[PDB]
Copies of this chain bind each other. A is one copy, B any other.
């Protein structure tokens, strides 16, 4: 059906997504004569990328790429915020029949590149260590994103043709947070002078800036030098 559905669990403050991408998948695999395991990896990257593309806050494109020292040294899917997808895989050898994700890629990484329509490019990387792509990607999110995130990816055949789908769950940012408010806190915070920040006690810096707002302060943490003597 090739559609991605967005939904919100009102009571848990968690968003979810579901995508089945299979007419798109066929156009991506079409006339490349990819062996089977390669076909599956791409079907999986396709779902992953489509699910991530939907979480984008700004217009731009995202690429989720696998590269390594294995028979399949490259697999990539690139998608934009309009859900237009494309990709390829490069093979250079020994693809065993029941290739593993680790077997296909070998020693490698999962590289995610986010290019905003406006601004500049960002790229993030984690070693490929999970057994599954969904698992590798959750490793990436766990280290790079505060909001807990889960990915579920399925692939198989339907009507003898390739088909795949997947779902995502991500904690939402607090309801309370208004955009104009956050911006106000920031503008306010920027009125801090170097001298005030560097010479006055912490509490005073805080009431001088935020006495109008309700603020809970926690126990401070000593910052110290990491010695080698």
Q: Which residues of A contact B (CB under 8 A)?
A: 1-14, 16, 18-24, 27-28, 50, 54-55, 57-58, 78-80, 83-86, 114, 116, 119-127, 129, 139-140, 142-148, 150, 152, 154-156, 158, 163-167, 169-179, 181-182, 185-186, 189-190, 192, 194-195, 197-199, 201-202, 205-206, 210, 213-218, 220-227
A83 with B225, Cβ < 8 A, contacts A165-B197, A176-B12, A198-B20 known:
no
**What residues of chain B lie closer than 8 Å to A20, measured between beta carbons?**
197-198, 202
- Report Cα–Cα, A175/B126, bound state, in Å: 30
Contact A83 B147 (CB under 8 A): no
Closest CB in chain B relative to A5 CB, distance in Å: 5
Contact B195 A13 (CB under 8 A): no
A3 with B202, Cβ < 8 A, contacts A14-B185, A50-B223, A181-B12 known:
yes
**What residues of chain B lie closer than 8 Å to A144, measured between beta carbons?**
114, 122, 124, 144-145
3 tightest A-B CB contacts, nearest first = A13-B174, A13-B176, A122-B143
Residue of B nearest to A214 (CB): B10
Contact A2 B198 (CB under 8 A): no
Residue of B nearest to A11 (CB): B214
- Report Cα–Cα, A27/B122, bound state, in Å: 33
Contact A186 B198 (CB under 8 A): no
- Report Cα–Cα, A27/B172, bound state, in Å: 41
Contact A176 B173 (CB under 8 A): no
Contact B226 A84 (CB under 8 A): yes
**What residues of chain B lie closer than 8 Å to A21, measured between beta carbons?**
223
- Report Cα–Cα, A5/B10, bound state, in Å: 33
Interchain CB contact (< 8 A) of A173 among B147, B202, B225? B147
- Report Cα–Cα, A28/B228, bound state, in Å: 12
**What residues of chain B lie closer than 8 Å to A182, measured between beta carbons?**
12, 14, 148, 150, 169, 171
| Contacts A/B (CB < 8 Å), 24 sampled | A3-B221, A5-B206, A5-B217, A7-B218, A11-B213, A12-B185, A12-B213, A14-B174, A18-B197, A24-B223, A24-B225, A80-B226, A116-B142, A120-B126, A145-B146, A146-B173, A148-B173, A150-B189, A156-B198, A165-B198, A166-B197, A169-B189, A172-B174, A175-B176
